Amino acid sequence: SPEAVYTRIMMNGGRLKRSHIRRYVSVSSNHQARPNSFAEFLNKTYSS
RNA sequence: CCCCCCCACCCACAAAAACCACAACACCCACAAACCCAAAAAACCCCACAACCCCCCCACACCCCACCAACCCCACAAACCCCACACACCCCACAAAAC
User: Fold this and answer.
1) Is strand B within 7 Å of residue A35 (CB)?
2) How many helices (H) and strands (E) does chain A have?
3) A39: Cβ–Cβ under 8 A, 6 or more apart, which residues?
4) How far is CA A7 from the centre of its chain?
C-alpha cells in the first residue's frame, strides 16, 4: 500500500537500506553502462 | 681434483676521502582572464513498418541399434625367467702411491 511504503521510508529516516544499495550496485555493475545512463549513474554513485 | 722458496687482505705514494660545494637558487609549479576534455535548439532504450516472435515442425519415424554365425585385439603342437658351454662373477688389483 502507499501508506505501508511511506511508513517504511519514514522508519529509515528517508535513507536507503543496505539491501537497496546492494541491489542497485548488482544491477549496475553487471551491465554495459551507457554514457549518461541510469546504469552509469548507479555505478558512479553507489559502489565500494 | 696439497705444496717453488719468501710469503701470504684480489691493503697501501703524498695529500686526502659525501660519486658535497661559483653565485643565485631550489614543487621534473605557474602567461592572463579564467579555471567540468558541459552545454545551439529539439531531444534522449546503440526501442519500434506491419504480421509475428522456440536460430519448432513434410510425413513415417526416432539407440550416429540390428544379415546371420558370433562375440578375449585366446589358442597348431611342444612350451613358457627377454635363465644357463665351461670357468666364473667389485664395470678391484703391476709396482709405488694415494689433500
Assistant:
1) yes
2) 3, 0
3) A27, A28, A31, A32, A33
4) 18
Helical (H) or strand (E) element with A6: helix A2-11
Distance (Å, whole) CA A28 – CA A31 = 6
Query: What nucleotides of chain B have any atom within 7 angstroms of a protein Cβ?
Result: 44, 46
R_g over Cα of chain A: 13
| Distance in angstroms (rounded) separating the CA atoms of residues A35 and A40 | 7
| Cα angle, residue A16 at apex, residues A4 and A2 outer, rounded to 5° | 20
A48: amino acid identity, one letter: S
